[PDB]
Coordinates of N, CA and C and ligand atoms in Angstrom, one line a residue:
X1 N 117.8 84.7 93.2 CA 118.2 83.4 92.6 C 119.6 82.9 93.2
X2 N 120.2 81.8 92.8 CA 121.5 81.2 93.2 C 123.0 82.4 93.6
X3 N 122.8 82.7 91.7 CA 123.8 84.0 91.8 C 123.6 85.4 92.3
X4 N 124.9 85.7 93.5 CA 124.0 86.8 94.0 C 125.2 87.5 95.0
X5 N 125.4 88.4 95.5 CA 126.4 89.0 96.0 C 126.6 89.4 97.7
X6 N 127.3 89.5 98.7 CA 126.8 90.1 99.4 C 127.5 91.1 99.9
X7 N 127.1 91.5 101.1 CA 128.0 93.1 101.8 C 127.5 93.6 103.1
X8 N 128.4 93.7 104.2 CA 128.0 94.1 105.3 C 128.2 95.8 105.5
X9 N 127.1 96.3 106.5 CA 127.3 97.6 106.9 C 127.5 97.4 107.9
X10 N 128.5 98.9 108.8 CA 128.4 98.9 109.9 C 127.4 100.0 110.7
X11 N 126.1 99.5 111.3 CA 124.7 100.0 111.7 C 125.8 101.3 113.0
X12 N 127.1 100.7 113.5 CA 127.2 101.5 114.6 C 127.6 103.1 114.4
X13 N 127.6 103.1 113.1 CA 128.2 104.1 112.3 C 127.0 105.1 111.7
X14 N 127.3 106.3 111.6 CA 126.1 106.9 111.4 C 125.4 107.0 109.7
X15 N 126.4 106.7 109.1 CA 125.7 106.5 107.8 C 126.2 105.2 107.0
X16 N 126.0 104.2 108.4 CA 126.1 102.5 107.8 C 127.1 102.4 106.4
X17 N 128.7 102.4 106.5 CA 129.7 102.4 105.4 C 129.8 100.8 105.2
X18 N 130.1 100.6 104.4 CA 130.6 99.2 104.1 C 132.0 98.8 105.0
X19 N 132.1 97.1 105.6 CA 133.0 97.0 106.0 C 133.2 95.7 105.6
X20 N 132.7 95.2 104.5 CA 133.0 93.8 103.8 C 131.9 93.7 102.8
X21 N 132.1 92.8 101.8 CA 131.9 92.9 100.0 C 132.7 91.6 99.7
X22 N 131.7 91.0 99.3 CA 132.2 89.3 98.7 C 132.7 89.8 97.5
X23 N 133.4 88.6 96.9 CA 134.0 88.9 95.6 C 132.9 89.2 94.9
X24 N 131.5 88.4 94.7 CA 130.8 88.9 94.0 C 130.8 90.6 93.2
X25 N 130.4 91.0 94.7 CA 130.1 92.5 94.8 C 131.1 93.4 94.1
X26 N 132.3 92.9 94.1 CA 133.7 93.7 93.3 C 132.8 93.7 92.0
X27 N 133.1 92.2 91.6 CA 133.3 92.0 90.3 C 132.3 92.2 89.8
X28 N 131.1 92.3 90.4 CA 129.6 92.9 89.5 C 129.4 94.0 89.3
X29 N 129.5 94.8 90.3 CA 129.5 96.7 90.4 C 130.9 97.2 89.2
X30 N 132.2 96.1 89.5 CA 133.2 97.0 89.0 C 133.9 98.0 90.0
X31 N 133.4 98.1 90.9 CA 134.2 98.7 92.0 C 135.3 97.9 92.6
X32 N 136.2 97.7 93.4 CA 136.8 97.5 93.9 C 137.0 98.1 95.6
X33 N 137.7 97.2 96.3 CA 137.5 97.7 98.2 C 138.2 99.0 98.1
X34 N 139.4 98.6 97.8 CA 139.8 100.4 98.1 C 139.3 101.4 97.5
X35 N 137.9 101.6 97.1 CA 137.0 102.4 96.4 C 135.7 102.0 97.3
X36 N 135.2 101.4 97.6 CA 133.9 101.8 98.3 C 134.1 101.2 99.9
X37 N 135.1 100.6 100.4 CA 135.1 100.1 101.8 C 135.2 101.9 102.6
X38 N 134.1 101.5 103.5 CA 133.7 103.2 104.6 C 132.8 104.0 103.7
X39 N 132.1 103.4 102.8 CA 131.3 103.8 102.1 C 129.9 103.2 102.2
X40 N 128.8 104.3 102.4 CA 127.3 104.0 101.9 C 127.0 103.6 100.7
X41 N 126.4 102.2 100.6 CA 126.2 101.7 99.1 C 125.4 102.2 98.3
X42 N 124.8 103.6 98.7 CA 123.9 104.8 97.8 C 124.7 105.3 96.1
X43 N 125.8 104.5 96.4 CA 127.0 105.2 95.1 C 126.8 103.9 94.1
X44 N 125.7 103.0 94.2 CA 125.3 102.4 93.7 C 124.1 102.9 93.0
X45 N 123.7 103.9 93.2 CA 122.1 104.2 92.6 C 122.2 105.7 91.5
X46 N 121.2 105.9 91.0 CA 121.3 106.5 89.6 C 120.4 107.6 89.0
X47 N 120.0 108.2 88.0 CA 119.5 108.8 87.3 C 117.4 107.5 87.5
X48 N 117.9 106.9 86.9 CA 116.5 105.9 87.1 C 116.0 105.4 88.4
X49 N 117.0 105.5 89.3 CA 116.6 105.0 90.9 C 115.4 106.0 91.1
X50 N 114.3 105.0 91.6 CA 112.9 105.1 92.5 C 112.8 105.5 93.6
X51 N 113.2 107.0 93.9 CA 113.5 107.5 95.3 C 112.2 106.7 96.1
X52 N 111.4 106.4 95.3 CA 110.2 106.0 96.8 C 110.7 104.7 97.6
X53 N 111.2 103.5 96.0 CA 112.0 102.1 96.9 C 113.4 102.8 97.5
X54 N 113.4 104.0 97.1 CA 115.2 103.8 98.0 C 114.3 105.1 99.3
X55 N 113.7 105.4 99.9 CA 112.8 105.6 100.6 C 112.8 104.7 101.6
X56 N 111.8 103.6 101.3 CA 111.6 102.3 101.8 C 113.0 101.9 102.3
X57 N 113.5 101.5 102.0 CA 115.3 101.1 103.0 C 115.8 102.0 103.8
X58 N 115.3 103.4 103.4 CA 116.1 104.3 104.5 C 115.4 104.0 105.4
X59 N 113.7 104.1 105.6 CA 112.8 103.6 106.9 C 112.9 102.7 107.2
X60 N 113.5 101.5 106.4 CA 113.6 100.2 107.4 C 114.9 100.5 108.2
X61 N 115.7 100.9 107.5 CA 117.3 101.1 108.6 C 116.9 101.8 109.9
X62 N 116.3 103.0 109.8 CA 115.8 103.8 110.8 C 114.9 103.2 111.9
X63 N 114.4 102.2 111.4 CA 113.5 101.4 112.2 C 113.9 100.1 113.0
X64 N 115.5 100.0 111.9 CA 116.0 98.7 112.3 C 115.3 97.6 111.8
X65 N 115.1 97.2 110.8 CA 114.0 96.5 110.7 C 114.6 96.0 108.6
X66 N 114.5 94.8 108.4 CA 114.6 93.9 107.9 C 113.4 94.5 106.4
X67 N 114.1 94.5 105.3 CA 113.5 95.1 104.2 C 113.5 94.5 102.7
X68 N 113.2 94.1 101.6 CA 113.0 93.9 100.8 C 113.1 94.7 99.3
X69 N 113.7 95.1 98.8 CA 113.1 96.2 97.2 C 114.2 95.9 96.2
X70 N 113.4 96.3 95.0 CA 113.6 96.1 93.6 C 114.3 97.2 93.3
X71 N 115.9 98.0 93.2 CA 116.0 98.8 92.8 C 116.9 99.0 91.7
X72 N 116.8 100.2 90.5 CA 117.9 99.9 89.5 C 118.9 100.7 89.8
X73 N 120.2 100.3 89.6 CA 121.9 100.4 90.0 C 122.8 100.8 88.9
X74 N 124.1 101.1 89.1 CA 124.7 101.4 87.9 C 125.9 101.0 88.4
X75 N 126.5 99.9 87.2 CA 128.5 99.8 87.6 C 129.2 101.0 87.4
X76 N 130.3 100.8 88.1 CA 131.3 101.8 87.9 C 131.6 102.9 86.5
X77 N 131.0 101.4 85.5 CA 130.9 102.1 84.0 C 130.3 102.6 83.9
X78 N 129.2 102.6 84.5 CA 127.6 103.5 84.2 C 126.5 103.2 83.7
X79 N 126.5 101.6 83.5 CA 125.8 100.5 82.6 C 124.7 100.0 84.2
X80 N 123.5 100.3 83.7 CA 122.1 99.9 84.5 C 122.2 98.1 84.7
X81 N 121.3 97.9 85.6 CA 121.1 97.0 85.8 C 120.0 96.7 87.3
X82 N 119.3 95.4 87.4 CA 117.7 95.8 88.3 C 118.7 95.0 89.2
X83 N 118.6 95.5 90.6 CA 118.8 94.8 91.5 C 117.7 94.1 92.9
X84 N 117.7 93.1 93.4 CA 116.5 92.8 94.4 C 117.5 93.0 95.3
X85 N 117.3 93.8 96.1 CA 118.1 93.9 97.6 C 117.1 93.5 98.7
X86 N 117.5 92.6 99.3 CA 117.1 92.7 101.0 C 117.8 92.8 101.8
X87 N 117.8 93.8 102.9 CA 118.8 94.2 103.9 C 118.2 93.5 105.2
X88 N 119.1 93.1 106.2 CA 119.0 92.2 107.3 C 119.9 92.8 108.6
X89 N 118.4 93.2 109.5 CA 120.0 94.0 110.9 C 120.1 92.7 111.7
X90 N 121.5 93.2 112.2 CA 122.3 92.0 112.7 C 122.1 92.8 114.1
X91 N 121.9 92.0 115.4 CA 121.6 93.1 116.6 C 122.5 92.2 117.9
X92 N 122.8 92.8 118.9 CA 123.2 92.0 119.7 C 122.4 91.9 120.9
X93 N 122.9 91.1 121.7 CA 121.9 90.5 123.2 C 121.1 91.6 124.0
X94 N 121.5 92.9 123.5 CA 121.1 93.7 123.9 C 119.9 94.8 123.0
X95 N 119.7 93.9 122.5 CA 118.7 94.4 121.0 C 118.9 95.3 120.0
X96 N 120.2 96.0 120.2 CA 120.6 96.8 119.8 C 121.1 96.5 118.0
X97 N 121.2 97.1 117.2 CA 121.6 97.0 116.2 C 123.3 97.1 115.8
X98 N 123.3 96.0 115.6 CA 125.5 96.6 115.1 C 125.9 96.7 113.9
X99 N 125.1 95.8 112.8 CA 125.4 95.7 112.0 C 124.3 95.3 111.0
X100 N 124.4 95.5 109.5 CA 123.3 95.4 108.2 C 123.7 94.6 107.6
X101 N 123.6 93.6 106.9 CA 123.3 92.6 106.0 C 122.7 92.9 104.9
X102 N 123.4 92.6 103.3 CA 122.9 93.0 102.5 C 123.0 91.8 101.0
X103 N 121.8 91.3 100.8 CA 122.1 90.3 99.6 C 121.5 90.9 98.6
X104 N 122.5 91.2 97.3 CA 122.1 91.3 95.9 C 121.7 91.2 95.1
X105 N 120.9 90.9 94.0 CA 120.6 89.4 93.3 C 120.6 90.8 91.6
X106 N 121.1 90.5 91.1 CA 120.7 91.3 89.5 C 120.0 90.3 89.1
X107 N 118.5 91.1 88.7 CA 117.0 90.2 88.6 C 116.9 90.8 87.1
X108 N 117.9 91.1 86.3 CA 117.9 91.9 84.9 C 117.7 90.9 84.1
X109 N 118.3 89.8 84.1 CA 117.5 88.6 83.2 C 118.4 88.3 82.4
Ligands
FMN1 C1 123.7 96.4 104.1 C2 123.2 97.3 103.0 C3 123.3 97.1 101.7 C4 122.7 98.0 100.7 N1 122.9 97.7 99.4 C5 122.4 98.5 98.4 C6 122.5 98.2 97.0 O1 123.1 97.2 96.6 N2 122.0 99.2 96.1 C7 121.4 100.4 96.5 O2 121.0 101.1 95.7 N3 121.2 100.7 97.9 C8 121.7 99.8 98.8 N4 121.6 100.1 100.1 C9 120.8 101.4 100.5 C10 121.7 102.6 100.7 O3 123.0 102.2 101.4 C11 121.0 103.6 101.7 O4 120.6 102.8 102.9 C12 119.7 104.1 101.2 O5 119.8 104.8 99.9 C13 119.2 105.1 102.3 O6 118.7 106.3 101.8 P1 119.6 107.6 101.5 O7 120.6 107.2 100.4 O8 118.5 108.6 101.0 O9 120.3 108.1 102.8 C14 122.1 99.2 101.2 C15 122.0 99.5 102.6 C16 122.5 98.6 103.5 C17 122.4 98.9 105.0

């Protein structure tokens, strides 16, 4: 929908850390940059996370390839919430992958 957050990985890195996070992303998670920047956004997921959709994004990253899933997340507090993520690789002229694109959306209602 409208409201919605975003966050870049760096693909050249071997386990894609964050290297930017809209204000959104702070202030929804409750995290802040000097807490998850060089970080895999996996510190987002939980006791209820669907290893099969968090599955699905590891094979799309591995593949390079542009992905879609519904997964549930937890703030800093520890408070759930459903998130729709689609991740987007960013590649250069040389088809290579450099970087991950990541939009948010809490689809919790
Ligand atoms: C750009 C980007 C944004 C991501 N955002 C989220 C997110 O908001 N929530 C989440 O649970 N996983 C998110 N992920 C997925 C994890 O970072 C990680 O790719 C996934 O869990 C891969 O499997 P693993 O943790 O088993 O290694 C994102 C991945 C990328 C590349």
């Amino acid at each position: 929908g409208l409201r919605h957050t975003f966050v870049v990985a760096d693909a050249t890195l071997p386990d894609c850390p964050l290297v930017y996070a809209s204000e959104g992303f702070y202030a929804m998670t409750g995290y802040g940059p000097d807490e998850v920047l060089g970080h895999n956004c996996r510190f987002l997921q939980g006791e209820g996370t669907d290893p099969k959709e968090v599955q699905k994004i590891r094979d799309a990253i591995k593949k390079g390839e542009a992905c879609s899933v519904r997964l549930l997340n937890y703030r800093k507090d520890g408070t759930p919430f459903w998130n729709l993520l689609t991740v987007t690789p960013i590649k250069t002229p040389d088809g290579r992958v450099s970087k991950f694109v990541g939009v948010q959306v809490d689809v919790t209602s």
